[PDB]
Amino acid sequence: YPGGSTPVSSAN
Amino acid sequence: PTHADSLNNLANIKREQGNIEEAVRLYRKALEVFPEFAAAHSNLASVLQQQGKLQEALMHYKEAIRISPTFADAYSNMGNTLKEMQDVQGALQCYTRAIQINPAFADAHSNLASIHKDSGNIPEAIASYRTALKLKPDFPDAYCNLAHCLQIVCDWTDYDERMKKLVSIVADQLEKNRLPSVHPHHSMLYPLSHGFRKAIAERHGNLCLDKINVLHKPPYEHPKDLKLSDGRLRVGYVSSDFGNHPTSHLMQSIPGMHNPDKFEVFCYALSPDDGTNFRVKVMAEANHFIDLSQIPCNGKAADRIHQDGIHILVNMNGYTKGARNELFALRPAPIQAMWLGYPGTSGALFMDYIITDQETSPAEVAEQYSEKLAYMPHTFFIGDHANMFPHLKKKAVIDFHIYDNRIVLNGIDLKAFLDSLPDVKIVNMPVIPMNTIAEAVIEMINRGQIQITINGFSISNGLATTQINNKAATGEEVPRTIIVTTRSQYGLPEDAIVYCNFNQLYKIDPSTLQMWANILKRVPNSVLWLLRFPAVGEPNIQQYAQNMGLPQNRIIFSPVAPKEEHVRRGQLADVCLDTPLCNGHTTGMDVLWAGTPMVTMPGETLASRVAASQLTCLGCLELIAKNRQEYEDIAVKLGTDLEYLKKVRGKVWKQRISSPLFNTKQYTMELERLYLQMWEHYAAGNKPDHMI
Numbered sequence: 001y002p003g004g005s006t007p008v009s010s011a012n
Numbered sequence: 013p014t015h016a017d018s019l020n021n022l023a024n025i026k027r028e029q030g031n032i033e034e035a036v037r038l039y040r041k042a043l044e045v046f047p048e049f050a051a052a053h054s055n056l057a058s059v060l061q062q063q064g065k066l067q068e069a070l071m072h073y074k075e076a077i078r079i080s081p082t083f084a085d086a087y088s089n090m091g092n093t094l095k096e097m098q099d100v101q102g103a104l105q106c107y108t109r110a111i112q113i114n115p116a117f118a119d120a121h122s123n124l125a126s127i128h129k130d131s132g133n134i135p136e137a138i139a140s141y142r143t144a145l146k147l148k149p150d151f152p153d154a155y156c157n158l159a160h161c162l163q164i165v166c167d168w169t170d171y172d173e174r175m176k177k178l179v180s181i182v183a184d185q186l187e188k189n190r191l192p193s194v195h196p197h198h199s200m201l202y203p204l205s206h207g208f209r210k211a212i213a214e215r216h217g218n219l220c221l222d223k224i225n226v227l228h229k230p231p232y233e234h235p236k237d238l239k240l241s242d243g244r245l246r247v248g249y250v251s252s253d254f255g256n257h258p259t260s261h262l263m264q265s266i267p268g269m270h271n272p273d274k275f276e277v278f279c280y281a282l283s284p285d286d287g288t289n290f291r292v293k294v295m296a297e298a299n300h301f302i303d304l305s306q307i308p309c310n311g312k313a314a315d316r317i318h319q320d321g322i323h324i325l326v327n328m329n330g331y332t333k334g335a336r337n338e339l340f341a342l343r344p345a346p347i348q349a350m351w352l353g354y355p356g357t358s359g360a361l362f363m364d365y366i367i368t369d370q371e372t373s374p375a376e377v378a379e380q381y382s383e384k385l386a387y388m389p390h391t392f393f394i395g396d397h398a399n400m401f402p403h404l405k406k407k408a409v410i411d412f413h414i415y416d417n418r419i420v421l422n423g424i425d426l427k428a429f430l431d432s433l434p435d436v437k438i439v440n441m442p443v444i445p446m447n448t449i450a451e452a453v454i455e456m457i458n459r460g461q462i463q464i465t466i467n468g469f470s471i472s473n474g475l476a477t478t479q480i481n482n483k484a485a486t487g488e489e490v491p492r493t494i495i496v497t498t499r500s501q502y503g504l505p506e507d508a509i510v511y512c513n514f515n516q517l518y519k520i521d522p523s524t525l526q527m528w529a530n531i532l533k534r535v536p537n538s539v540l541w542l543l544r545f546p547a548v549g550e551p552n553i554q555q556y557a558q559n560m561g562l563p564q565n566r567i568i569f570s571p572v573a574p575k576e577e578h579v580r581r582g583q584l585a586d587v588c589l590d591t592p593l594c595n596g597h598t599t600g601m602d603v604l605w606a607g608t609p610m611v612t613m614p615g616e617t618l619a620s621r622v623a624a625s626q627l628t629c630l631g632c633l634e635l636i637a638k639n640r641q642e643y644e645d646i647a648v649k650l651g652t653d654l655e656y657l658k659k660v661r662g663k664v665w666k667q668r669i670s671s672p673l674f675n676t677k678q679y680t681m682e683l684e685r686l687y688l689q690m691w692e693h694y695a696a697g698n699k700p701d702h703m704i
């Protein structure tokens with residue numbers, strides 16, 4: 001999010 | 013010398029073949045014949061980089077550029093190495109420098125675009141990919157990555173041709189046995205046949221096998237019984253996501269819920285400790301926690317696993333960031349199963365099982381997977397919401413006639429606060445009448461104030477969560493204040509139906525937006541609620557919606573929120589419209605935990621069926637559509653037949669507790685049952701077969 005982080009699945 | 017040239021060229025093909033060890037040896041012989049051989053240096057660096065020997069790779073790249081100061085390829089390949097090392101500034105210098113030397117160097121433009129994409133600058137990434145494609149129109153890597161950028165921002169220009177182009181490119185690469193430019197983790201987004209998707213995954217598993225063959229490890233001999241482990245099954249969970257990540261947000265309670273009499277749990281982290289409570293919990297509750305990020309060599313790491321005596325090794329990554337599937341390619345364990353982080357087949361012969369379920373992966377469709385199916389009894393999906401977000405088990409509303417999703421309160425101490433109020437009516441949902449108290453809450457919301465006190469209780473504005481307690485904002489702690497959530501905080505109408513989807517925009521395709529527009533046209537009193545995920549997709553969605561006959565103001569965008577606010581604010585919606593191309597998985601558990609009914613249309617890919625499997629376990633078959641018309645009919649019904657909406661919402665609200673969906677203890681015991689099924693099967697000397 002803005003002011004932080006929102007980790008998500010992502011390709012290697 | 014030309015003797016050096018033939019050595020260099022032989023090594024190049026040896027690399028192409030994936031004989032990594034042979035290539036390296038020839039490159040070195042080349043440099044022995046002709047030490048000032050810039051290309052040999054650069055080629056050696058490249059195969060060293062392929063093995064993870066990044067410092068040594070850098071040394072030979074710098075050597076090649078020392079010999080040849082305008083060797084553009086060396087700068088570009090050097091920047092790839094720097095990128096893998098996490099040195100993004102270095103890689104930028106390398107790529108940019110390569111383009112100054114040769115502005116027609118397509119690969120360097122493509123490599124610069126990928127840097128822009130990684131940092132989220134999709135507009136700049138799209139622009140550099142287009143230069144790459146302009147300079148070199150047959151460029152599969154640059155085309156497939158451009159296609160993914162356009163997907164991320166919901167750019168559907170020429171969408172149908174793009175899809176056909178992607179299939180043809182993949183078809184051509186698969187025939188020529190090369191590594192396809194469509195990443196396996198993206199292949200459900202494109203209309204590839206199931207066999208192509210399985211083949212893309214298979215090509216990536218093969219990469220792993222090439223990298224470990226240069227180790228010349230002999231097969232491991234595996235335990236044949238449970239005698240050295242006191243009758244306990246040794247299960248090892250391999251993940252790069254033990255920390256602040258959706259994987260931990262789903263399964264962090266499961267290690268500590270294993271039965272110590274029958275199971276011994278080993279957690280192999282592939283990432284370093286990120287300091288969060290997610291990592292603390294898993295470290296504290298597994299029997300054994302091993303930090304394999306400290307052990308970068310896959311030969312030792314697989315040794316380390318094999319010594320622990322693992323019977324079942326659980327691959328929680330597949331082809332996702334941080335994966336180290338070489339570990340599984342080395343087969344340190346007799347049974348290796350894909351579990352929960354990768355929504356697709358690995359296509360790899362070193363993976364024996366995929367833990368799924370009947371609804372996600374019906375046997376009829378077993379051909380999509382290289383692995384044997386291992387059915388959990390309900391859904392294979394799980395979520396830690398009951399533990400992370402217990403303040404959301406109950407809610408109260410304010411009667412500002414009575415809505416369950418306009419002004420909501422949640423709190424661990426909610427009941428005590430309610431008991432301190434003079435007039436409160438139940439409907440079971442407590443309702444606070446519009447007294448002086450009720451106006452102070454609304455006053456705080458309207459005024460953007462962070463918090464207030466009523467009867468000694470702390471009343472927090474749901475938007476100020478990271479200022480009140482940042483660990484509660486992220487899901488690391490349970491909020492210790494009472495939190496107020498309203499439709500006014502998000503510009504949502506108090507007097508209309510709110511359809512929401514909180515997924516990343518890339519999961520929307522043209523068909524899905526058309527369905528959603530059909531739904532909103534039929535329900536004039538309603539809005540679609542979406543996230544700036546990323547914000548540069550917002551204008552494309554808006555435009556396609558307006559070309560579909562949809563005023564701008566029917567679609568309301570919000571920013572991505574911290575984890576707890578994201579889950580909590582789902583209470584404000586009436587209905588979640590799920591993305592059929594790829595469902596909400598984690599986000600589907602989030603929306604159900606808020607009590608919000610979700611309409612879904614299961615496709616054939618695993619990623620297109622997770623949501624329907626969740627609702628089946630939840631016990632809401634009426635929310636599962638068999639085609640687009642049924643999907644629109646279910647959504648329009650829930651937005652117009654308001655007693656039916658009230659009924660379905662109560663069902664979800666209640667069923668998220670009484671069903672197995674969010675029941676991690678029951679899930680951990682089902683998983684155990686399924687493990688012993690896998691083991692006994694193999695302990696009688698059988699090879700992997702389907703477990704139903």
Ligand SMILES: *C/C=C/C(=O)N[C@@H]1[C@@H](O)[C@H](O)[C@@H](CO)S[C@@H]1OP(=O)(O)OP(=O)(O)OC[C@H]1O[C@@H](n2ccc(=O)[nH]c2=O)[C@H](O)[C@@H]1O
Nearest residue numbers: 008009258259352353355572573575578594596597598599
């Ligand atoms: C089509 C590909 C789908 C995919 O990658 N799914 C994986 C799933 O299979 C794994 O099971 C999860 C790792 O264990 S991750 C992911 O599920 P998904 O529903 O796709 O969610 P993501 O897009 O990967 O991550 C979103 C993530 O961000 C949180 N969040 C969303 C909005 C917001 O405003 N704030 C916020 O914190 C969600 O809770 C969720 O973690």
